[PDB]
């Protein structure tokens with residue numbers, strides 16, 4: 001009865017979760033194998049795309065599976081330490097993603113306003129240093145505050161969760177909710193939007209078939225940026241609203257918005273099918 005409902009729901013939800021995991025992983029392996037085996041896809045810009053695929057891969061392999069076992073079994077099975085590690089990895093991947101999108105926007109702005117300065121300034125070795133720098137900064141603002149417990153609240157319902165090994169709710173104090181949201185998300189979001197609008201203005205101020213092909217590619221990048229925003233902004237708006245008033249937004253919708261964020265990790269591989277070169281490498285690799 002209660003037990004039959006539980007069996008039906010657990011089995012259906014395990015299946016949906018396996019699908020999501022599979023889509024995230026297969027799609028981002030494909031992006032990475034495509035770029036890694038197609039000389040024509042090995043541009044500097046695509047080094048940043050690979051990094052973005054690595055963040056989404058880590059969400060497919062680690063973040064979503066743990067989150068799935070929690071949603072399905074209705075308890076955390078893995079101990080306190082893995083709860084904190086899982087949370088740190090979650091925060092890391094969102095931070096690395098939006099910082100990397102920001103870099104991509106800046107790379108394109110430079111290329112479109114100073115193609116020659118771009119040429120002498122930007123090399124493989126420098127792109128790699130930029131990628132490492134993004135992951136370094138992202139790890140810094142993710143792991144250390146979570147591992148030093150700067151996020152913990154003193155409310156008794158929070159302390160209840162922190163003491164129960166089967167609770168892995170990321171219940172935070174307000175200061176951390178604000179500061180961490182601004183540092184990991186809002187600041188790079190704003191930078192990315194400001195730069196992406198400038199790139200649009202510059203594109204509008206611009207042989208003909210080659211200019212077309214570039215503009216198709218710029219719009220692809222513009223779409224991954226806009227869809228990332230659409231997928232995560234609702235979550236981070238509710239995160240701030242909750243600080244000021246917990247009743248304005250029902251909890252089920254806050255949770256749904258987190259899952260929409262996770263869903264973003266399956267979207268870029270599909271969006272890259274707008275490109276002939278990606279489409280051809282995908283077809284070939286699936287052989």
Ligand SMILES: COc1ccccc1OCCNC[C@H](O)COc1cccc2[nH]c3ccccc3c12
Nearest residue numbers: 067090091094095170172176177180181184255258
């Ligand atoms: C809504 O909770 C969940 C329910 C079921 C399964 C997984 C769930 O996710 C719990 C962890 N999700 C974290 C979110 O997936 C990512 O949240 C963040 C990413 C980057 C910086 C951040 N700064 C912050 C301050 C407060 C809350 C979140 C963040 C945060």
Ligand code: NA
Nearest residue numbers: 161162164167
């Ligand atoms: Na706990």
